[PDB]
Write a protein that binds this ligand. Structure first.
Ligand SMILES: CCCCCCCCCCCCCCCCCC(=O)OC[C@H](COP(=O)([O-])OCC(O)COP(=O)([O-])OC[C@@H](COC(=O)CCCCCCCCCCCCCCCCC)OC(=O)CCCCCCCCCCCCCCCCC)OC(=O)CCCCCCCCCCCCCCCCC
Ligand SMILES: COC1=C(OC)C(=O)C(C/C=C(/C)CC/C=C(/C)CC/C=C(/C)CC/C=C(\C)CC/C=C(\C)CC/C=C(\C)CC/C=C(/C)CC/C=C(/C)CC/C=C(/C)CCC=C(C)C)=C(C)C1=O
Ligand SMILES: CCCCCCCCCCCCCCCCC[C@@H](O)O[C@H](CO[C@H](O)CCCCCCCCCCCCCCC)COP(=O)(O)OCC[N+](C)(C)C
Ligand SMILES: CCCCCCCCCCCCCCCCC[C@@H](O)O[C@H](CO[C@H](O)CCCCCCCCCCCCCCC)COP(=O)(O)OCC[N+](C)(C)C
Ligand SMILES: CCCCCCCC/C=C\CCCCCCCC(=O)OC[C@H](COP(=O)(O)OCCN)OC(=O)CCCCCCC/C=C\CCCCCCCC
Ligand SMILES: CCCCCCCC/C=C\CCCCCCCC(=O)OC[C@H](COP(=O)(O)OCCN)OC(=O)CCCCCCC/C=C\CCCCCCCC
Ligand SMILES: CCCCCCCC/C=C\CCCCCCCC(=O)OC[C@H](COP(=O)(O)OCCN)OC(=O)CCCCCCC/C=C\CCCCCCCC
Ligand SMILES: CCCCCCCC/C=C\CCCCCCCC(=O)O[C@H](COC(=O)CCCCCCC/C=C/CCCCCCCC)COP(=O)(O)OCCN
Ligand SMILES: CCCCCCCCCCC1=C(C)C(=O)C(OC)=C(OC)C1=O
Ligand code: SF4
Ligand code: SF4
Ligand code: SF4
Lengths: 318, 115, 70, 156, 96, 176, 215
């Protein structure tokens, strides 16, 4: 009965991911004075299915100079981690109830970068190597600021348990207490998921395709699935962290609907941002994260440590 | 036990997808199709040649700044102690030293990439 | 249209409805219909183990009330 | 026969999938490419048909030869064609790619890209209008729809 | 004005000859607009116009399902338009 | 007479400094860009429903070539070979002889459509309006050989498109 | 390469991602046009200049026509000259739209390209209405233009021109004050006036360095 729950978690996420691509194509089209897919099925509803079937019936190729083991391993790691990172999310109940869900999510995020790194290295191509090194630089840019922002925000929660975030935001959204950090956190997510304006690991206009230039058909589709799943997952995490839906223990579907709508709003905001802005230079991203985000993050961490002691508002559950 | 089952299920699904992608379609592999890609032409050198890092000093500093995260994560539990003054002093002191490290590297041109 | 973007979005929303809802229902189906117990600390686990031991059917969620003190 | 019906339905499904999702390589040579850029423009919106440009040859399905092919460029075109995984299609767009066109008698121009790669559709014009190119892609979709790979395999 | 657009949608549903006509036009042309009929071909193509649409969408053709020898319920193309309606449809003239 | 594009100095009063600091900290111009995209989202798209809707053209449009006839059905071409001489791409090949009734007519009239640049110089050079560029543009083929037009193909094109060709010429001939 | 315009082979020596040397290899679109011109008459040679710079067609037509008219010692009639200048400015609008939007696409702002290519489509309609070709008009010839303007063309040009300014305003709202755009463009590829003069530059590549020169 637990396997049924695992499947009911993972399959709808993939279905959601497939449809997310259709939505982005349409949203991008209408923001660009066009329509997007509206021919394959009504309103392009069959377009993701056609894309998946085309990708999984095409010939995959092994580069002659590539390292086969790592080349095959990297997409499996990417997709498996993208699927795994959904299990502690309370919606309003988690599939896996952890005492430390935030730290688990951080560790799995840190492990997810190695799919990009090993695909770029094992491709044995110059553009893939450039993309992998850009991924290294991106992680060095965002990691510490992201972690300290998480710590500062969770100082108001009292623990690292995700479900407690529902109780913390019972009467007011946490954003109203931490709207500055939230903005930075949002930007960090954009850097964490390699999304525009920080789409540097792929960098289509500069590196052709970056780390996944040598990948074709099914492994490439798996990389795409993992990236879009990570986008949806991080927006869901942001919605849980900063926009707390009211939970009724006898009517959890209300919480589920609220949470899903907030997550969809955040994802559409991601697509909007992609439609609106140019691309950073990957040294400018590091300078932004280390010379602007880090000092404010440290000062706000100091302030958020001092604040509950000052006002006698320390949360329970040591 | 449940987390092990979930991890096994996810890895199995990904591996099965890879197996389907590699065994279902028709494969026609020849030397020109599998050659490395450099947009029209044969690469001059190897991709295994050294690739210079212009942000090496920031990369090293990231190692030291990554352990401040370890030191600062138990703060929610540390906030529950009776002697809040000592805990607050130590946390503020640790963050102040981190900020001083950042300032020292910033003023010594340590955040500028090598030319 | 712009409302022609809505159908696909709706599909996505429906998909995102499935996991959490499913979890809730499953949590009710395997826990007597009453919101699967949370044990973050060893005291809660001890309470669950005592409940299972005194249930008489090796199931913690079978609750014994004042009718069991004869 | 049950097997013939099954392979026919599977052929239908795979052909629909392959023609409803056609990803041409980001690849243009000359003035014709400008008209290709007008086929992705809002008025025609090729993305509404499921047609998306992808830079990597490994992730592309169609070669549109939009422009003159010189002798200096022919090895690169053949290389990035060979690096396309199969099934792959080539659309020759414009007089220069079709047969040389205005530079047919030059010392440095390949007299038609079909000397280098096999061609599925020839789109006439100098340049063909974006609407004419869209007609060419739709004709290629119909041609892909006429494929019977699994029926041929079953009848072997 | 939401009820107005909803009523316009229902009118588009009712003006295509029922739900079956609405579905036929949706899955044949990816469009459910209703315009004044201009004429018909000897091959079966129906030509509609709507002067309230912007230049480019103000004239269109619903293709026939059966041309010279082939079934064109799904396989339609612009080359099926005869020259006279070709001149009308491409706005080289203002007269059908 | 000229102007400068990047020669303005920002004011240094406290109000301007605070406005710029709030711009830096709260990202107002980025929000302006987002607002521009959102405004475009609710506009009507410019896409047409091809192939059911077609882009506008002109009577002067240069498309597929055709050979015309007189109202009696006699061919307009007289094998003067002006189109062949003027063709910038040498796409026209012509051979002629006296007909069985002594008329001056072609025996070969080929146009290489993969050599043609579709410039319309041939229909300018023609003194009898025999060769024209028609309005058709949707004639993509599946083989190269199908685009090598001989006299029969061009005469068929003329017989097939004459109704539209004559109307276009009637609309245009007072500008020529 | 998406940034190589299809026919540029830039051989770059790099230290990390820092560029140590750029060696452009060109000729992947060398068709021997200048040798082909020697076998054509002047009118036959005219359509090559359409395909020289296929973003600014009528401007190359005008340059060739002016050269031939100077050699012939003749004068185009005034209405032909006014039509030439009008369509040359329309062509400048087309070229600058293409340049700015493809530049922004290369940096990463892909949205203004779609907004401005509808305007490009409308000017292509103007080209087709005046000559029957969307790009390669061959309209400007030594001696004047091939045909007179059709009735109603001026009104449509006025309708387009009275609204093009708001499209420019929207593009400027997207790019000009954006801090990402300035971070990507400010102080990048700086060239001095003396170096620009000595290296043979012209046009904006001169006027960006403060040189007051317009032909
Ligand atoms: C006890 C003994 C240890 C058992 C090792 C486990 C199995 C790995 C060895 C099999 C791979 C070798 C195949 C091969 O050589 O060519 C492929 C074969 C032959 O092609 P070829 O071109 O002729 O050969 C090229 C050369 O011969 C050589 O080609 P090459 O350039 O690819 O050579 C490198 C390859 C060659 O292998 C070797 O050199 C010898 C094998 C010994 C490797 C053991 C080193 C220890 C590493 C750490 C411990 C890992 C776990 C081991 C413990 C076992 C218990 C689980 O070594 C590897 O890359 C294997 C790495 C395995 C680690 C994978 C774990 C993923 C980490 C993700 C993060 C985890 C989170 C925290 C936890 O082609 C194929 O069959 C298609 C692809 C097959 C690859 C499928 C996936 C690879 C195996 C996955 C690992 C299992 C994890 C569970
Ligand atoms: C500016 O141009 C561009 C765009 O704009 C037009 C884009 O959209 C764009 C993004 C790419 C799109 C064309 C989307 C492509 C769609 C995917 C690659 C297909 C992935 C979908 C499947 C592989 C997911 C699996 C499908 C299943 C049915 C899900 C359920 C799983 C089963 C086991 C059940 C790019 C890169 C681009 O460059
Ligand atoms: C979505 C997640 C769920 C998926 C669930 C299904 C998972 C599927 C996993 C992969 C299967 C998909 C591949 C499609 C069919 C498999 C065909 C292949 O794997 O086996 C063939 C079998 O070939 C074998 O080498 C010969 C068969 C003999 C070996 C079998 C051992 C036992 C059989 C002895 C006979 C007695 C019966 C015993 C069993 C009861 C090899 O064909 P090959 O040409 O190389 O590769 C190209 C395949 N093409 C043609 C389809 C493109
Ligand atoms: C469950 C996971 C495993 C399977 C994964 C894939 C799931 C199945 C894929 C979903 C199938 C839906 C696709 C059907 C869409 C057809 C729509 C219609 O357009 O097709 C028409 C006719 O249909 C096609 O001829 C055939 C497509 C139908 C496929 C046959 C059904 C086979 C299903 C078997 C599924 C088994 C999966 C594997 C099991 C192991 C042809 O019209 P077309 O020319 O395009 O359009 C012209 C454009 N116009 C309209 C604007 C003018
Ligand atoms: C169906 C029959 C299955 C046969 C399996 C054979 C596997 C194999 O190595 O073959 C190579 C095969 C295709 O080669 P060809 O033979 O040339 O193409 C087929 C056409 N003849 O390659 C593959 O498909 C590789 C498939 C991968 C196997 C799956 C196991 C991978 C294990 C990954 C573990 C690492 C996980 C990391 C994340 C976990 C961390 C929490
Ligand atoms: C790989 C990543 C390993 C870490 C996974 C983290 C799992 C996790 O955090 O769940 C914690 C969970 C519950 O802990 P609490 O939250 O404190 O609640 C208890 C009070 N009721 O702990 C557990 O369930 C322990 C189960 C064993 C841990 C799993 C170990 C797996 C490690 C990876 C091995 C992979 C297989 C070996 C092959 C190597 C790769 C080729
Ligand atoms: C994650 C989303 C997608 C999940 C992946 C599953 C995709 C399901 C696709 C089902 C459609 C049916 C696939 C048919 C395409 C197979 C590849 C193909 O076309 O090979 C053609 C090939 C041509 O061979 P020849 O003519 O003899 O040689 C000519 C060359 N010298 O013919 C064949 O090999 C026939 C093979 C039968 C196909 C198997 C059908 C069974 C489908 C099961 C799907 C499994 C789902 C899990
Ligand atoms: C009484 C005590 C109270 C405590 C104090 C509270 C007051 C705090 C006042 C300051 C708050 C500022 C918060 C913002 C933090 C960073 C802002 C910043 O300055 O960063 C910018 C840059 O920041 C950016 O521009 C971001 C770029 C990425 C853009 C991606 C899309 C933008 C997002 C749009 C919507 C944002 C929504 C966020 C919240 C979503 C909800 C979770 C610096 O970069 P430059 O301008 O180039 O100058 C550097 C050299 N001086
Ligand atoms: C995604 C928006 C439309 C992009 C279309 C990609 C077309 C690729 C052709 C390559 C090319 C580019 C990029 C290009 O910019 C250009 O102008 C100089 C060409 O000459 C006409 C080209 O051939
Ligand atoms: S066919 Fe004409 S428009 Fe196309 S590339 Fe050749 S010269 Fe340019
Ligand atoms: S249109 Fe021009 S190139 Fe074509 S046949 Fe006529 S004169 Fe020759
Ligand atoms: S088509 Fe006209 S110009 Fe050409 S040979 Fe015939 S009559 Fe002379």
């Amino acid at each position: 009965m637990f396997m049924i729950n695992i499947l009911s978690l993972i399959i709808p996420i993939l279905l959601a991911v497939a449809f997310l691509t259709l939505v982005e194509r349409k949203v991008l089209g209408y923001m660009q004075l066009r329509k997007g897919p509206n021919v394959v099925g009504p309103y392009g509803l069959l377009q993701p299915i056609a894309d998946a079937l085309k990708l999984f019936t095409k010939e995959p190729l092994r580069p002659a100079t590539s390292s086969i083991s790592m080349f095959i391993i990297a997409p499996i790691l990417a997709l498996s981690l993208a699927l795994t990172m959904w299990v502690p999310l309370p919606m309003p109940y988690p599939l896996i109830n952890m005492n430390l869900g935030v730290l688990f999510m951080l560790a799995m995020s840190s492990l997810a970068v190695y799919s990009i790194l090993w695909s770029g290295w094992a491709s044995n191509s110059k553009y893939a190597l450039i993309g992998a090194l850009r991924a290294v630089a991106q992680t060095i840019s965002y990691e510490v600021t992201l972690a300290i922002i998480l710590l500062s925000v969770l100082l108001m929660n009292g623990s690292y348990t995700l479900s407690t975030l529902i109780t913390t935001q019972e009467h007011i959204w946490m954003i109203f207490t931490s709207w500055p950090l939230a903005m930075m956190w949002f930007i960090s997510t954009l850097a964490e998921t390699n999304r525009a304006p920080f789409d540097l690991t792929e960098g289509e206009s500069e590196l052709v395709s970056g780390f996944n230039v040598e990948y074709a058909a099914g492994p490439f589709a798996m990389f795409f699935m993992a990236e879009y799943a990570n986008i949806i997952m991080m927006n869901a995490f942001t919605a849980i962290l900063f926009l707390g839906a009211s939970h009724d223990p006898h009517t959890p579907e209300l919480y589920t609907i609220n949470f899903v709508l907030k997550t969809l709003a955040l994802t559409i905001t991601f697509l909007w941002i992609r439609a609106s802005y140019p691309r950073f230079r990957y040294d400018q991203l590091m300078h932004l994260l280390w010379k602007s985000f880090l000092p404010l993050t440290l000062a706000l961490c100091m302030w958020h440590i001092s604040l509950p002691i000052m006002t006698a508002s320390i949360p329970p559950q040591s | 036990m449940n987390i092990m089952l979930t991890l096994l299920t996810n890895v199995t699904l990904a591996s099965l997808l890879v197996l389907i992608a590699f065994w279902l379609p028709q494969l026609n592999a020849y030397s020109e199709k599998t050659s490395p890609y450099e947009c029209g032409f044969d690469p001059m050198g190897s991709a295994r040649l050294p690739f210079s890092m212009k942000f090496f000093l920031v990369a090293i500093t990231f190692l030291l700044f990554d352990l401040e995260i370890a030191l600062l994560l138990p703060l929610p539990w540390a906030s529950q102690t009776n002697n809040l003054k000592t805990m607050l002093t130590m946390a503020l002191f640790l963050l102040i030293l981190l900020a001083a490290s950042l300032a020292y590297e910033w003023t010594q041109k340590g955040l500028e990439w090598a030319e | 249209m712009w409302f022609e973007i809505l159908p696909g979005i709706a599909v996505m929303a429906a998909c995102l409805f499935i996991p959490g809802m499913a979890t809730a229902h499953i949590h009710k189906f395997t826990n007597g219909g009453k919101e699967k117990r949370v044990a973050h600390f060893s005291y809660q686990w001890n309470l669950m183990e005592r409940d299972r031991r005194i249930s008489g059917v090796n199931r913690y969620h079978v609750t014994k009330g004042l009718e069991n003190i004869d | 026969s049950r097997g013939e019906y099954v392979v026919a339905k599977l052929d239908d499904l795979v052909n629909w999938a392959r023609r409803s999702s056609l990803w041409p390589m980001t690849f243009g040579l000359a003035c014709c490419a400008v008209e290709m850029m007008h086929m992705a423009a809002p008025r025609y919106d090729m993305d509404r048909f499921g047609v998306v440009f992808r830079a990597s040859p490994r992730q592309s399905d169609v070669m549109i030869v939009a422009g003159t092919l010189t002798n200096k460029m022919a090895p690169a075109l053949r290389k990035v064609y060979d690096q396309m995984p199969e099934p792959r299609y080539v659309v020759s767009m414009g007089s220069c790619a079709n047969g040389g066109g205005y530079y047919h008698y030059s010392y440095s121009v390949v007299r038609g890209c079909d000397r280098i790669v096999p061609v599925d559709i020839y789109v006439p014009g100098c340049p063909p209008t974006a609407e004419a190119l869209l007609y060419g892609i739709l004709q290629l979709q119909r041609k892909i729809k006429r494929e019977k790979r699994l029926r041929i395999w079953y009848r072997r | 004005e939401l009820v107005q657009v909803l009523r316009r949608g229902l009118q588009q549903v009712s003006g295509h000859g029922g739900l079956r006509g609405y579905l036929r036009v949706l899955f044949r042309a990816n469009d459910v607009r209703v315009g004044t009929l201009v004429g018909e071909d000897k091959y079966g193509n129906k030509y509609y116009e709507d002067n309230k649409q912007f230049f480019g969408r103000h004239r269109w053709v619903i293709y026939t399902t059966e041309m010279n020898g082939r079934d064109t319920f799904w396989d339609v193309d612009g080359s099926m338009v005869p020259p006279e309606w070709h001149r009308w449809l491409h706005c080289m003239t203002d007269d059908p | 007479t000229y102007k400068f594009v990047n020669m303005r100095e920002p004011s240094m009063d406290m109000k301007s400094v605070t406005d710029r600091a709030a711009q830096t900290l709260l990202w107002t111009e980025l929000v302006r860009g987002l607002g521009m995209t959102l405004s475009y989202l609710f506009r009507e798209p410019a896409t047409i429903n091809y192939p059911f809707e077609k882009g506008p053209l002109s009577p002067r449009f240069r498309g597929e070539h055709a050979l015309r006839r007189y109202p009696s059905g006699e061919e307009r071409c007289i094998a003067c070979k002006l189109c062949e001489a003027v063709c910038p791409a040498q796409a026209i090949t012509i051979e002629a002889e006296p007909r069985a009734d002594g008329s001056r007519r072609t025996t070969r009239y080929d146009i290489d459509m993969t050599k043609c640049i579709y410039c319309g110089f041939c229909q300018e050079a023609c003194p009898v309006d025999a060769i024209v560029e028609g309005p058709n543009f949707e004639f993509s083929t599946e083989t190269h050989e199908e685009l090598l037009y001989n006299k029969e193909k061009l005469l068929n094109n003329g017989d097939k498109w004459e109704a539209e060709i004559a109307a276009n010429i009637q609309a245009d001939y007072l500008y020529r | 390469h998406p940034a190589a315009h299809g026919v540029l082979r830039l051989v770059m020596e790099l230290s990390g991602e820092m560029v140590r040397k750029c060696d452009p290899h060109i000729g992947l679109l060398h068709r021997g046009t200048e040798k082909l011109i020697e076998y054509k008459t002047y009118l036959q040679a005219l359509p090559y200049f359409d395909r020289l710079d296929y973003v600014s067609m009528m401007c190359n037509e005008q340059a060739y026509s002016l050269a031939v008219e100077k050699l012939l010692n003749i004068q185009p009639p005034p209405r032909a000259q006014w039509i030439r200048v009008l369509f040359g400015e329309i062509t400048r609008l087309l070229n600058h739209i293409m340049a700015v939007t493809t530049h922004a696409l290369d940096i990463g702002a892909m949205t203004p390209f779609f907004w401005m290519f509808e305007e490009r489509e409308k000017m292509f309609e103007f080209y087709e209405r005046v000559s029957g070709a969307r790009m390669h008009a061959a309209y400007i010839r030594p001696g004047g233009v091939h045909q007179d303007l059709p009735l109603g063309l001026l009104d449509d040009i006025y309708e387009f021109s009275k609204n093009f300014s708001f499209r420019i305003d929207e593009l400027e709202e997207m790019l000009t004050n954006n801090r990402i755009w300035r971070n990507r463009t400010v102080d990048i590829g700086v060239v001095t006036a003396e170096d620009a003069l000595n290296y043979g530059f012209s046009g904006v590549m001169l006027r960006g360095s403060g040189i007051q020169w317009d032909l």
